[PDB]
Amino acid sequence: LEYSELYPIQNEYRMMQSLDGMWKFQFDPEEIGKKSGWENGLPAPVSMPVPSSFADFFTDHKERDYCGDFWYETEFYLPAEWRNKKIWLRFGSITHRGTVYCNGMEITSHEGGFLPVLADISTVAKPGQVNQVVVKINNELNETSLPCGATKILNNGRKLAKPYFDFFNYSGLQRSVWVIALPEESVKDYSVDYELCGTDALVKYEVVTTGEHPVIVRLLDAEGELVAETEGKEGILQVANARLWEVRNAYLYQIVILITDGNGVLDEYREKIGIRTVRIEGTKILLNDRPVYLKGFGKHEDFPILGRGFHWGIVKRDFECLKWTNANCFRTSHYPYAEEWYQFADEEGFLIIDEVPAVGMMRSTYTYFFEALTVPELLKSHIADTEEMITRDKNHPSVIAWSLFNEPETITDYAYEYFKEVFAAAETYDFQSRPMTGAFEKNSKPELCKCYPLCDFICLNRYYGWYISGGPEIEEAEELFRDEMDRWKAKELNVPFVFTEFGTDTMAGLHKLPSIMWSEEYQKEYLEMNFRVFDSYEFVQGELAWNFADFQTTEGIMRVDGNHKGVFTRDRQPKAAAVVFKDRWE
Template sequence: MLYPQANEIRMTSKLDGMWKFSNTSQVDLKKPLTHAQLMAVPASFNDQTLDKQLSDYVGTVWYERNFAVQPETLQKRLVLRFGAVTHQAKVYINGQFVDQHVGGFTPFEFTINDYVQVGINDLKVAVSNILDNTTLPSAAYDEKTNHLEPRFDFYNYSGIHRPVVLYTTNFTYIDTFDINYQLTGEQAVVTPSAEIVGPYDQAMITYFDEDEVLLGQSSLGGSFMIDKPKRWNVMDAHLYAAEIKVYQKGQLLDTYRQEFGLRTIKVEDGQFYLNDKPVYFKGFGRHEDFIASGRGENLALTNLDFNIMKNLGANSFRTSHYPYSEEEMMLADKRGFLVIDEVAAVGLYNDFSVNTGISQTDSSTWQVLQTGKAHKQALKELVERDKNHPSVVMWSLANEPAGQQEGAYEYFKPLFEYMRTLDDRPLTVVNISMSGYQLDKVSSLCDVLCLNRYYGWYVDNDDLTKAKQDLAQDIEGWHELYPNKPIIFTEFGADTIYGKHSLYHEPYSEEYQWDYYEANFQVFDKYDYVVGEQLWNFADFKTSPSLIRVMGNNKGVFTRERQPKMVVKLLQKRWHKQN
């Protein structure tokens, strides 16, 4: 599925803006929504009003707007595309059901010529935020009481979260366009592939440098050699472009332009190599989360976050715990950030609760959860969307599953095998502390060990001396088991209330957060096979109400409004020195 692009053949029109909105259960598809209010799109609906019941609403809500179609538009293929709707969308045009999509973080589109008319058309979208034992993310849902208990520690924002676009193509059109290449020494051989629907007799590809310098041309199915290519590198991004044109008897039928970067990835001997040089991941776990917009796309905020991270000396982030917007991935390509791209497989732990923690005796996860089908589909959609991004250097198949329980290996093995048929980038599953090296059944499948550890917070709280000892023992245990696999710490952090200080460096103070990170860094630096540190979290974020969550999760090194906590100075000094 190609990202919408306007050119000499394709027209695009955004349907973002203020939509009618209602959470009424009864809707007449032939009539306008009744008792409707206005709701911004793209954005979550939860925090746009003062209605707490709506903020916490579980079930189906309705969005509606009109759009116009000109007579000449229907001479072409007309497509309606959603960047993401969380978590399930059913789409209706002029009272007719068009189609549906399940999965809240990847795009979907429908050809709608058979549903529209010249003039004004009515578009309705039914959006459900219900999650259960079959969905990603996973949640415990009681249909009788309509009670939903997330198995994850972030707010279950819902709505039309990413842009809605109408676009046109001819009836012969480019459906996929992928950049494949081999990079050896001073040469890159590029062999793009494409799926083209409809009749055509010629497809040509033209190549450009980052400065729009014409490099040459090849036919589809052929190859093109770039001499002495400039490689895409961490925080030093160089992007080429390939433009495909499809013809029939000399007439241009479709065209599409795809940016790409040239770089190599290799994992061996306990190191992660980018362009044959070892790289150290410095950065954060993050959330798409902000005031009012919720999880909705916020390009200004994304741009600010990237500038903040660059200023700190960070070079990476993980899309915790779901794919981020396509626009954010494009920006990562341009800025040179390394991305661990994670599917929305969070909550794969049956007896998880933010309030009560995780049961140490429960072993039923892989019997209770029935997420395999959704998981495979989500992986497919993620790779199809993001495979052309040079910033994506690793795929994460899940965050903190119950990897120590019986059935975990059998669940993940076919998913790893499937992913390796889709792409050759390194694979990982982010490991939770309860699934330590003594018990874990999944990490043998991984190329890189990604660990979430909270020694000094959830474990050894307020005893950083013991925390350092336990952390060191943990690292050494993993290395003894998998001596050739590098280790990245993808989460570690301590809740910190902005502006709270303590002479005694007590937990929740900014002083304790500084001490906590300094202690962890001292341990990491002892091991050359620890190749990354991604703090949890970049910024404070909203969660469901909880006695251990003071107005949300406060592990950010920035507040939700992006004001720095004291530890930012420590990070800035450390990460710039590591360069």
């Protein structure tokens, strides 16, 4: 809340300059960088591309598996014309923790590796000269920040990451970095909310600025024609014959927020928004007052060599595959994605369940998690990341729901009190108050779980046919699945249910007749068993398969070069089961 989450733009009042490219990089295993003056320059750097994860570049284990402090450095020329402007460094993310230095001066620190980091360098910046940014980063895992895990010290002293989650601990500067210039009085934040009125629609808004001058808000349609205008930091814009934002059929209006002093304009921010409503009614999920069935996948930001590094080419291919399967939805498991994904989703008309990195809240590399004395601190960084996510993503039409956890322990009252504070925080930060949920693991039995009442709809991760029974026992897997669903049904909660995870590990090329658990044929049979079960219950309103694509995990005896529950290979090619989704979702 002390900086703007707004995506940077370029106009007459705002400037931006990319810092993507080869940075300087150095591991700091002895943790002596600060005492040694590295914040003024790295002594023995290697080259490192930004944006990217560092891990997959190296050819030796110790660098790939590095856990601890490590440093980035680059230089950049500041145009003279940026002089008395507010000058900020904007990192798409810093994974997981970091301190930003600029021209030798400490600027800011941040916790949480999947959301923007802003550093005000106005006082130390040097316009018309070359400037320096240095970043100290740490990638360790603990139980006081998200995502949760442990750090092991080997008997040579080198650190090892021990995730409580099932994905590789990629880290570094994984998203784009900008240096930007803002007017001294600027638009800092805004929120929009929608109401449908017959052929018309109301856009309710509120604006936060860093000053006191009047704010003027305009709405332009997709052709740049003015359709509404009002003055003030709060208001309602009326849109005649409103073109609603629809599933797989986007329409985007453009909101224009101006700061003025009666003489001239002081600032202007523009963004594309979509007029749409989301709500839950009974067991229905309503988009623009109509029932919608969620069809899609959980994904990962994951790609060969780049790691979690952002690239538009990955966005384009993934969306072409999504469209090919006739999906309409994905969950950003298990963390907020780079902002460009939501922009693209907005344009393509895809629905998004936006997920906070609240994963690994079951201490296993019943565990009595949420009773440690570290939990109050865990809770505050959880609420912090939720605040940052919601503030940054709330105005994306594609975002229809917040997912506030994935597979935590929920069967005690400690868990209820923890998650109650998170849901309360989330609802206060969302101007639209859209649906909130989390993904439940099987241990959260309907008789035992205490947290599902907090949810607007219920998300289940279930693996009947894989981790439970399955293989020769798949007939028993279906009976067990129907039994649990009967118990949920008997509770008569009158809420929608969405399956957010279900799948089988599948090796591309493994064929067997009859099928065996890792073969491509088993994946299809498993999917079709699950489909029969889904379709047996009226309150089931969505299916998000796990996973869109094979992705990297911590290595171990149960992961053959990562997770193979993908419907696509890691290089984005379809396994036989992809067509099953394609035909059903059509």
